[PDB]
C-alpha cells in the first residue's frame, strides 16, 4: 500500500504517474477504494473545517502583516496621499536600487503596497490602530484553532455525525438562513451601529466601553416602542468628514442612498439598515422548512407538488429532492452557480457603489478588486458546470428522475446545445464583423463610416434609474412617474446626486463601444455556456460514444477509431471552456480597466472614439497603458513597477509554456523520455543512480490540465501585472 493509499489501483503503478495522480485524485473522495457514505461525508465535513481554518489563518496573516509591517495608522491619518502597505519585503536578491525603490509609504525598508482593499475595508468597519488589527489577528487565530479542534472532533467516533444528519436539508436550510445569513447580518448590524458608525463619527467604541457608549441618544427605547424613525432622525450631513465628530449626525439607521460626499462611498448608516433588513428577512425566511416542531415545509412534497398539469414539464420536479440530497455534486454545482452569480454581483456592485471609505479614490485597488471577483467567479461558475457534468456521470439516476425537468433536459439537450451554438455564432459574426468593419473604416481614413450602435436599451434602463443625460424621461428621470414620487422623499435625493455625477463609476455613460463589448461579453458567456452545457448534457453519452458514463468523468479519449475521439469527455469540455472563461473575463476586465482608465484621468472621449475598433484596444489600451509597465526596469535603471514588469514577462513565460502541453502531445515526449531513460541507464557514473518511479511522459488528461493551469497562471499574472502597473504607476 504505497502512496496514494486511497486508491489501490494507483499504488501498483510503477511510474511517475502514481506520484502525479495521487496529488490530483486526493480530494476526489468518492472515487477512492473501500470507500463508504459515512467516510465520504465526514471527510468532506473535516475538509470544510480545514478550509475554514485556512481562510481564517489567511485573514490572520493579512491582518498581522498590516498591523506589523504596514502603516495602517499613517493611512488612517491621510487615506488620499499614503499608499497602503501590505507587508515588508526581505529578499536576499535585491541590490541597493531595489531596496531604495521599493521603500514606499514612509516605511523603514522595502515594502509591498497593498492593492487588496483591506485598509479601506478595515477603516470603514472601525479598525483604527495597529493594536486593533493585532487583536483581530489573534482572535482569528483562535477562531481557526477552534475550527481545527472541531474538524478533529467530528472525525472522532464519539462525535461522528451520520449521513442522515448530513442529508437533513430542511434543518440545514433553517439554521443557515436563520443563523448563518440572519444572526450574522444582525451581528454585523450590531457592529456597524455600535462600532463603525461612532468610529466614523469620531467616538472610540471598543470592548472596554461597549456597555457604556450608547449608539443613539435614546437607545432601545424607540426600538421597542415602535417609533423606529428616531433611528433615522439626524443623519450625517454633506459637510461630514469621515472619522471626525464635526459635521456628523446621531441617526444609526438611515435610508439616504447614494454616496458619502467626501469618500465617494456608501453610508455606514445605510449599510447598517441594509443589514438589519437582510437580517430580519433572513431570520424570517429561516423559519420556512420543517425540522422538529410540526410546522414548516417538506421540500420533497414542494418539489412533488410543483408539476404543471398540462404536461409541458413532464413530471415537473418529482424525484428531484432525493436527486439533490443524494448527489453531493448537484449541491456543489448549485452552490457554485449561486456563488459565481454573486461573486460577479460582488464585482459589479463594489465599483459602481463603493462600500468602503476612500476605496473609490484608490484606482488600482478598485481595478484589482473587480478583476479578482470576475476571475474567481469565472472559475466558480465553470466549476458549477463541471460539477453538473460530474453529477450526470456519477450521480444522475435516470430511473429516479423519470420524465422530470432534469430528465427532460437530457430529452431536448441537442436543442439547448444547438441554440446556444446559434446564439454564440450570431454574437461572434456580428461582434467580429462590426469590430473588423470599424477597424477597416479607421484604417481607410473614414471614422464616420463605422456602424456605431447606441445601446439604447441599457441607456433606457439608466434613464429609468435616473440618468438625465440621454433625455428619455420615462420614470425616475421624469417627475410625472409614480415611482419617482414614491421615491423622491425617501432614497432618491442621495441616488440622483450619486448617479448624475460624472466622476464616479455609478452607471457610467455608455456608447457604441460599450454596445460592441457587451456583445463580446454575451459572446463570451454564450460560448462558455455552450461548451459547458454541451459537456454537462453529453456527459453520459452521445452519438459518437454512448457509454461516456461508464468511462468516468475525466477520461482522456476513446481511441483514433470512429473518426477520432479526442477531447470527447466532459472534463475536456470544461478544459476547453476554461479558455473561454479566460477570454470572457479578459474581455470584461479589458472593458472595465479601459472604461475606468479613461474615466479616472478625465478623457472619456478616448474610450468613446477608440473602443469601437480593435486597433484602439491594441494601441490606446494594450500599448498605451503598457508604457510604464515594461519600463519598470531598463538598462538605465529600475523603478518601483519592476516587480510588475517581471511578473508581466513571467506571465508570458508560463502561458506560453502551457502551449507546450496544449499543442505537443504525449507520445513524442514518451519516446523522448524513452531515449532519456536509455541515456541514464548507459551513462557511466550516472547509471549507479536508479529511479524507483519509471520516467514516463505526462498523461493525456494531466497534459491538458498542466497546459490549462499554466495558461491560467500566465493569463492571471500577465493581467495582474499589467493592470496593477498601468494604474498604479500612472494614478488616474
Amino acid at each position: 500500500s504505497r502512496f496514494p493509499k486511497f486508491s489501490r489501483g494507483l499504488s501498483q503503478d510503477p511510474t511517475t504517474r502514481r506520484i502525479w495522480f495521487g496529488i490530483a485524485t486526493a480530494h476526489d473522495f468518492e472515487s477512492h477504494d473501500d470507500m463508504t457514505e459515512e467516510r465520504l461525508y465526514q471527510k468532506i465535513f473535516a475538509s470544510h473545517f480545514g478550509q475554514l481554518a485556512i481562510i481564517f489563518l489567511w485573514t490572520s496573516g493579512n491582518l498581522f502583516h498590516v498591523a506589523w509591517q504596514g502603516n495602517f495608522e499613517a493611512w488612517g491619518q491621510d487615506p488620499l496621499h499614503v499608499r497602503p502597505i501590505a507587508h515588508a519585503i526581505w529578499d536576499p536578491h535585491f541590490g541597493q536600487p531595489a531596496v531604495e525603490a521599493f521603500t514606499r509609504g514612509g516605511a523603514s525598508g522595502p515594502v509591498n503596497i497593498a492593492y487588496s482593499g483591506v485598509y479601506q475595508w478595515w477603516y470603514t468597519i472601525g479598525l483604527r490602530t495597529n493594536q486593533d488589527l493585532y487583536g483581530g489577528s489573534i482572535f482569528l487565530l483562535f477562531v481557526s484553532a477552534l475550527f481545527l479542534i472541531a474538524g478533529w472532533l467530528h472525525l472522532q467516533p464519539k462525535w461522528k455525525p451520520s449521513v442522515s444528519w448530513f442529508k437533513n436539508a430542511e434543518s440545514r436550510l433553517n439554521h443557515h438562513l436563520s443563523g448563518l445569513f440572519g444572526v450574522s447580518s444582525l451581528a454585523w448590524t450590531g457592529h456597524l451601529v455600535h462600532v463603525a458608525i461612532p468610529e466614523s463619527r469620531g467616538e472610540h467604541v471598543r470592548w472596554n466601553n461597549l456597555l457604556t457608549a450608547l449608539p443613539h441618544p435614546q437607545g432601545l427605547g424607540p426600538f421597542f416602542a415602535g417609533q423606529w424613525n428616531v433611528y433615522a432622525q439626524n443623519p450625517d450631513s454633506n459637510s461630514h468628514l469621515f472619522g471626525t465628530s464635526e459635521g456628523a449626525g446621531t441617526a444609526i439607521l438611515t435610508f439616504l442612498g447614494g454616496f458619502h460626499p467626501q469618500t465617494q462611498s456608501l453610508w455606514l448608516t445605510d449599510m447598517a439598515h441594509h443589514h438589519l433588513a437582510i437580517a430580519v428577512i433572513f431570520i424570517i425566511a429561516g423559519h420556512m422548512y420543517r425540522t422538529n416542531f410540526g410546522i414548516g415545509h417538506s421540500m420533497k412534497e414542494i418539489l412533488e407538488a410543483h408539476t404543471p398539469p398540462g404536461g409541458r414539464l413532464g413530471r415537473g420536479h418529482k424525484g428531484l429532492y432525493d436527486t439533490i440530497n443524494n448527489s453531493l455534486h448537484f449541491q456543489l454545482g448549485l452552490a457554485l452557480a449561486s456563488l459565481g452569480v454573486i461573486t460577479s454581483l460582488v464585482a459589479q456592485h463594489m465599483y459602481s457603489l463603493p462600500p468602503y471609505a476612500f476605496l473609490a479614490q484608490d484606482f488600482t485597488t478598485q481595478a484589482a478588486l473587480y478583476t479578482h471577483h470576475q476571475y474567481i467567479a469565472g472559475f466558480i461558475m465553470t466549476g458549477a458546470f463541471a460539477h453538473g457534468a460530474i453529477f450526470f456521470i456519477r450521480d444522475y439516476n435516470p430511473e429516479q428522475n423519470k420524465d422530470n425537468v432534469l430528465a427532460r433536459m437530457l430529452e431536448h439537450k441537442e436543442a439547448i446545445i444547438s441554440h446556444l451554438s446559434w446564439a454564440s455564432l450570431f454574437l461572434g459574426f456580428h461582434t467580429l464583423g462590426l469590430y473588423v468593419h470599424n477597424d477597416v473604416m479607421l484604417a481607410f481614413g473614414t471614422p464616420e463610416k463605422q456602424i456605431l450602435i447606441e445601446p439604447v436599451f441599457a441607456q433606457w434602463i439608466q434613464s429609468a434609474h435616473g440618468k438625465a443625460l440621454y433625455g428619455f424621461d420615462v420614470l425616475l428621470s421624469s417627475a410625472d412617474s409614480p415611482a419617482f414620487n414614491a421615491g423622491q422623499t425617501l432614497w432618491l435625493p442621495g441616488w440622483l446626486d450619486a448617479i448624475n455625477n460624472n466622476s464616479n463609476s455609478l452607471f457610467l455613460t455608455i456608447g457604441p463601444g460599450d454596445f460592441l463589448v457587451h456583445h463580446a461579453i454575451a459572446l463570451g458567456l454564450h460560448t462558455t455556456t455552450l461548451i459547458l452545457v454541451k459537456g454537462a448534457l453529453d456527459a453520459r453519452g452521445s452519438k459518437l460514444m454512448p457509454d461516456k458514463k461508464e468511462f468516468g468523468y475525466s477520461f482522456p479519449c476513446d481511441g483514433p477509431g470512429r473518426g477520432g475521439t479526442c477531447d470527447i469527455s466532459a472534463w475536456d469540455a470544461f478544459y476547453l471552456a476554461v479558455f473561454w472563461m479566460l477570454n470572457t473575463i479578459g474581455w470584461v476586465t479589458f472593458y472595465w480597466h479601459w472604461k475606468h482608465i479613461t474615466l479616472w484621468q478625465g478623457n472619456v472621449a478616448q474610450f468613446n472614439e477608440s473602443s469601437t475598433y480593435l486597433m484602439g484596444w491594441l494601441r490606446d489600451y494594450l500599448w498605451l497603458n503598457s508604457s510604464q509597465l515594461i519600463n519598470g526596469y531598463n538598462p538605465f535603471g529600475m523603478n518601483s513597477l519592476s516587480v510588475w514588469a517581471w511578473m508581466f514577462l513571467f506571465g508570458h513565460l508560463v502561458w506560453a509554456t502551457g502551449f507546450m502541453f496544449l499543442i505537443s502531445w504525449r507520445g513524442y515526449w514518451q519516446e523522448l523520455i524513452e531515449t532519456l531513460a536509455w541515456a541514464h541507464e548507459r551513462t557511466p557514473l550516472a547509471n549507479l543512480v536508479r529511479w524507483k518511479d519509471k520516467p514516463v511522459a505526462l498523461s493525456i488528461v494531466q497534459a491538458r490540465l498542466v497546459g490549462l493551469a499554466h495558461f491560467s497562471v500566465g493569463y492571471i499574472f500577465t493581467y495582474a501585472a499589467f493592470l496593477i502597473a498601468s494604474t498604479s504607476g500612472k494614478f488616474g
Partner: peptide, 30 residues
C-alpha cells in the same frame, strides 16, 4: 505600533494552531 512581546504571543498561538492543523491532518489520514 505593536510591541516585541506581542509577536511572541502571535508566534506561539500560530504554533498551537499549527499543532491543531497537524492533528487534523493525522485524523484526515486515518
Amino acid at each position: 505600533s505593536i510591541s516585541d512581546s506581542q509577536i511572541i504571543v502571535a508566534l506561539v498561538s500560530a504554533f498551537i494552531t499549527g499543532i491543531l492543523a497537524l492533528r487534523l491532518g493525522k485524523s484526515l489520514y486515518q
